[PDB]
Amino acid sequence: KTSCPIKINQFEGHFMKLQADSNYLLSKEYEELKDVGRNQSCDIALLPENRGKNRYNNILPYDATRVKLSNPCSDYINASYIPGNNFRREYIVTQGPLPGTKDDFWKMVWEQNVHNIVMVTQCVEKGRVKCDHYWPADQDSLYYGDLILQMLSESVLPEWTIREFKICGHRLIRHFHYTVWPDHGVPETTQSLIQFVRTVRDYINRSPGAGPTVVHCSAGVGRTGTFIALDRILQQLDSKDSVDIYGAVHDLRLHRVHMVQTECQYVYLHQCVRDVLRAR
Numbered sequence: 001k002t003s004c005p006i007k008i009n010q011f012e013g014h015f016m017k018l019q020a021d022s023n024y025l026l027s028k029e030y031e032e033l034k035d036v037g038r039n040q041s042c043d044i045a046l047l048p049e050n051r052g053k054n055r056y057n058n059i060l061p062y063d064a065t066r067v068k069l070s071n072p073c074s075d076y077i078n079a080s081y082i083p084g085n086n087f088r089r090e091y092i093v094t095q096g097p098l099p100g101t102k103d104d105f106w107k108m109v110w111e112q113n114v115h116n117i118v119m120v121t122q123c124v125e126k127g128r129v130k131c132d133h134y135w136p137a138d139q140d141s142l143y144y145g146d147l148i149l150q151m152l153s154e155s156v157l158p159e160w161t162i163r164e165f166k167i168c169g170h171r172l173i174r175h176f177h178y179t180v181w182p183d184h185g186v187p188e189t190t191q192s193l194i195q196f197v198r199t200v201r202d203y204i205n206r207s208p209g210a211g212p213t214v215v216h217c218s219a220g221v222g223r224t225g226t227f228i229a230l231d232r233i234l235q236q237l238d239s240k241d242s243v244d245i246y247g248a249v250h251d252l253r254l255h256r257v258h259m260v261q262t263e264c265q266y267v268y269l270h271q272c273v274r275d276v277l278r279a280r
């Protein structure tokens, strides 16, 4: 079972059924997803030479779907290709860059022709480090390996910040930083992330020639996976007679471990779809 498409006119009642008896059926469904993709190895990520390149020793890309750097395991980064609604390498998902891997991160961005980066963690959350600050921070410039990055602009809004960089190897990169998503949790409202996703999707659509969209949080699984699932399902709502949350999360899990990492995130995806449909 790899799919559970729900007619739009039936979604409200479907989600109610899932929610009944303290989420009995929802939990059952989410538990199934936890077995998806589990037959796959992560041998490369486990090589001694790569140990320092992983933020979490237990969050590693599958060998089958990892992103390779050009060029020993100088080819290694903790990142995975993820299909979307539209094509098979629609996203690259990655961990929050480390001080010692941010040059690798930018090399990947360059080599993969990335124009858009989505960041859904803060660098520090409740005093715990989640992500290195890996960009130049005030209209200035810094080297990252063989590349130079320069900030062109920064627009701060209450729930996200959008930055534009030039990268020289001069491509323009947009960086979409959602700043109000607690780790292992969900945003305070469906409205907030729905708007953020629609905004990013608008920019993606306006990015002719772009490679994959990079999406990351801290581990590159929970908040990242929820973002991608919501991006996919919102497109389904706009273009199709049905919506397949289970199928989206299934497909994510085939490609990287733990995608959509808590049950409350899975619930939140349903609440988002329910709220969009109520408004429509």
Ligand SMILES: CCc1ccc(NS(=O)(=O)O)cc1
Residues within 6 Å of the ligand: 056, 059, 121, 183, 184, 217, 218, 219, 220, 221, 222, 223, 224, 261
């Ligand atoms: C314990 C490793 C771990 C840390 C953080 C997360 N959440 S996140 O993927 O949303 O950053 C998931 C897993």
Ligand SMILES: [Cl-]
Residues within 6 Å of the ligand: 061, 066, 067, 068, 069, 075, 076, 077, 078, 079
């Ligand atoms: Cl890799």
